Design a protein around this nucleic acid. Structure first.
Lengths: 32, 117, 156, 64, 100
RNA sequence: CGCGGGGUGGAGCAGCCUGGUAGCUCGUCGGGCUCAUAACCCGAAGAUCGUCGGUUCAAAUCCGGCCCCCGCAACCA
RNA sequence: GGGAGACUGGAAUUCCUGGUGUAGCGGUGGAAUGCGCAGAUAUCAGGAGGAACACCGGUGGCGAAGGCGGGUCUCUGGGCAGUAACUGACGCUGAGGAGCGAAAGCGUGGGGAGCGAACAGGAUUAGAUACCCUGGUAGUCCACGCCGUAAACGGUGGGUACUAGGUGUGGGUUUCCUUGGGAUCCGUGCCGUAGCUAACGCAUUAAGUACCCCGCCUGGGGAGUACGGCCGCAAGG
């Protein structure tokens, strides 16, 4: 179809990836 | 210095210039002529007129060591192959062969990927 | 009349006093506007002063100066890809006569004699010997053409 | 070309890696292998010619 | 940077003077090539049970030749903002595009 | 302490050991290039040898100093 | 070019030693960092080492899908046709389940030529944390395992029967002229009726006409995210 749907989805995915970069450490230690 | 009865040319026509050595059968080079050494620099170095002046100066420095007959060996893709052969046949050396020895890899080392400009 | 092809040009009558295409064409390029009669008085008076300083036929002196300023190659202008390329091009006959007469008139007009007649006389004489600034502009135009020979290939 | 073959049409002929004449009928003046369109092979014998020329290059019988 | 501010059919509030000065002043920042600016402020749509269409025209003699630039908007500040965004991109292009 | 080399358009660099013929590179404006910008390209505007001294036709050039410049490597100065 | 193991081949790039030989080479839209003048680029001879396999080779073959092309040898998997010798419905699908599964990435040990994220400098630009240039580490390679994801796409689950044709090409049987056509079974493309579709299109390799089993959907965001559990060395799934 259009690539707009694909790109909205991918924006969400990207943002999430970044959010796991920055909290990586914090999730390990707060979880442990 | 010495005399050489006949030699072979080497023309490296790689886009930004042509480097024209001449060489005996042995392969030693009596003299080497290039567009850059003529006086052109930069993008003017790429031009076929730079190849004509490179083969002119290469044929004069060639003729100072007494070469008369030449077998021409031209390299791969670029501007200035038949122009350098032309300036050689006019500038004091005669035709001989025109051998297109392009160095062909056969999917060898992977080439640089793509220039997007 | 460009973009439709070549346009037909006006035929030019020759000179009454001297009998040349090139004298009348020098008059029409002397013509700072309005006064063709005064342009004829400048050209005629300047060529009889050339007759005084040569003692010969003035149109032979004129055509020898015209030959000694006449260019063979002109530079121009085509900018291939983000760089301005001075491209040398073969000059037509009419284009070469036009550059010869136009340079002759303009650089006579820069010269520092009192009237215009003495200016044009001294410029036709100095261009006949080869000592005017206009001959130096021919040598500078061939300097730009021979200095820029490589870019000429485009075949343009 | 636009023939149908010589091996599939003449219906008896063996392609032999020792035989340097038959393999040099199908390489070019450069030494490179000609196509199936240029020589008109059936596909089986185009595979066997290509492998046979390639073996003959491996044992120095063709100028690579 | 000489800045002429004409109406077209409109009052010219001290808010409009100051805002004009600061948007257009962005251009003084980074395009040193500027000379004269001429800025003229139309006002229609008004009177018709509808919302007034403003229009801004801006003229700019650079150091060299003459830009022009025209914008229509429901209000005046939003229009002059938009006009300065456009002008900034253009000029650096007329800055751009060159450099061999 | 010396023996040396070391000076030449604003500058850097030669040339200066075998006298007649001082170049060279950025600081130079004007062009052509583009509808343009700039570059790219062309040309142009400055030293006759830090300077002064003898001989030889001819002297930066050869020889005497100096202003200098130092390299240092020495100094139980 | 189905897979695995083993041995080996040449062209090319890079470095190395040695010749020949001089001031540029490289690079670009134009340049500059860069390598040079200590002997580079160029050319000739020899050596090392690694990776990828020009030509054949394409709308072509094989594999369940990923995927598979230098050669040879060794071990092994599937398919197709022909005869009909045998068995006699042993078929189909398949929730959960186990296995395989590009690239990137991960662990331990090797290897490291070319290419090359990150990382520098140069340039461009208002500014480039970018494109373009010069260099460049992990990686790319092999051995042994992890991981489980893709536009893993024919964007089309698997099986079966039927429904006008025309023309290419791949594998094999046969009747006729005597390689040429015919007919047939299996494959893969291009065009085309009927029928179907929202339309584009599909169209005997169906998205047509029907039957069997599975997966899955129920407005857009929030979100394939939280919480919880499972797997994983981690990234994460």
């Amino acid at each position: 179809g259009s690539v707009i749907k694909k790109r909205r989805k991918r924006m969400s995915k990207k943002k999430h990836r970044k959010l796991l970069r920055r909290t990586r450490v914090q999730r390990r230690k707060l979880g442990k | 210095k010495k005399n050489v009865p006949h030699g072979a040319a080497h023309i490296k026509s790689t886009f930004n210039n042509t480097i024209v050595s001449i060489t005996d059968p042995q392969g030693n080079v009596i003299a080497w002529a290039s567009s850059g050494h003529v006086g052109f620099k930069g993008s003017r170095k790429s031009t076929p007129f730079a190849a004509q002046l490179a083969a002119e100066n290469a044929a004069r420095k060639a003729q100072e060591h007494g070469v008369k007959k030449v077998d021409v060996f031209v390299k791969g893709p670029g501007s200035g192959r038949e122009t350098a052969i032309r300036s050689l046949q006019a500038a004091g050396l005669e035709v001989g062969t025109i051998s297109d020895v392009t160095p062909q890899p056969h999917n060898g080392c992977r080439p640089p990927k793509r220039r997007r400009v | 009349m460009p973009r439709k092809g070549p346009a037909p040009k006006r035929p030019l009558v020759n000179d009454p006093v001297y009998g040349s295409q090139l004298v009348t064409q020098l008059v029409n390029k002397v013509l700072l506007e309005g006064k063709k009669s005064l342009a004829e008085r400048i050209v005629y008076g300047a060529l009889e002063q050339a007759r005084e300083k040569t003692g010969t036929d003035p149109v032979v002196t004129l055509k020898r100066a015209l030959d000694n300023v006449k260019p063979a190659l002109e530079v121009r202008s085509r900018r291939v890809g983000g760089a301005t390329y001075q491209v040398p091009v073969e000059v037509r006959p009419d284009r070469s006569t036009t550059l010869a007469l136009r340079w002759l008139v303009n650089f006579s007009r820069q010269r520092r004699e009192k009237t215009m007649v003495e200016r044009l006389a001294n410029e036709i004489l100095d261009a006949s010997n080869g000592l005017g600034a206009s001959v130096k502009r021919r040598e500078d135009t061939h300097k730009m053409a021979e200095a820029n020979r490589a870019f000429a290939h485009y075949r343009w | 070309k636009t023939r149908k073959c010589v091996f599939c049409s003449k219906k008896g002929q063996t392609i032999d890696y020792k035989d340097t004449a038959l393999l040099r009928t199908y390489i070019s003046e450069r030494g490179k292998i000609r196509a199936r369109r240029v020589t008109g092979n059936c596909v089986q014998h185009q595979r066997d010619i290509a492998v046979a020329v390639k073996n003959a290059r491996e044992v120095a019988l063709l100028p690579f | 940077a000489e800045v002429v501010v004409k109406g077209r059919n409109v009052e010219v509030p001290d808010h409009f003077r100051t805002y004009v000065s600061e948007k257009l002043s962005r251009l003084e920042r980074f395009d040193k090539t500027i000379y004269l600016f001429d800025v003229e402020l139309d006002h229609e749509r008004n009177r018709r049970q509808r919302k007034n269409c403003q229009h801004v025209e801006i003229t700019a003699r650079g150091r060299g030749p003459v830009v022009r630039g025209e914008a229509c908007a429901d209000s005046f500040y939003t229009a002059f903002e938009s006009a300065v965004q456009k002008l900034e991109g253009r000029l650096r292009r007329a800055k751009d595009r060159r450099k061999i």
